[PDB]
């Protein structure tokens, strides 16, 4: 309902505060987002002679 879109890099973060950490401990993040780098002007047709 409120997507994170934050215009600077580390402005919103996700926090885990662990209480017991083993040796090869890691967080496996998985994201899901919208992004847009391109614009999409209108296309071309054939018109066979």
């Amino acid at each position: 309902d409120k997507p994170i879109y934050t215009l600077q890099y580390g402005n919103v973060g996700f926090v885990v505060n662990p209480k017991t950490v083993n040796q090869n401990a890691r967080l496996l993040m998985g994201y899901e987002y919208f992004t847009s780098r391109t614009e999409l002007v209108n296309a071309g047709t054939i018109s066979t002679t």
Binding site: L7, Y9, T38, L40
Partner: protein
């Protein structure tokens, strides 16, 4: 703004021993000519950049095209023979 005592007045200051009069007169200190030494370099390898920065990042775009648009096989409606 003192009040004069009329019963016990006093006079002006009398001479007293003095502090050897030339030893209260200073010399005028005699400056020689000077120079900011060395040949100065024209530029300096600065640790910070001298230009502006941006507070926020803005998303940039570039236009792309789509492709050659083809025809289609539509599912076509039935004939309006007064049922529709």
């Amino acid at each position: 703004m003192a009040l004069i005592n009329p019963q016990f007045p006093y006079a002006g200051p009398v001479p007293i021993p003095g502090p050897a009069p030339t030893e209260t007169m200073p010399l005028l200190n005699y400056r020689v000519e000077g120079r900011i030494a060395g040949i100065q370099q024209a530029r300096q390898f600065m640790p910070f950049l001298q230009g502006p920065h941006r507070e926020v990042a803005e998303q940039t775009y570039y236009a792309i095209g789509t492709g050659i648009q083809m025809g289609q096989t539509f599912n076509q409606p039935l004939i309006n023979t007064q049922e529709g």
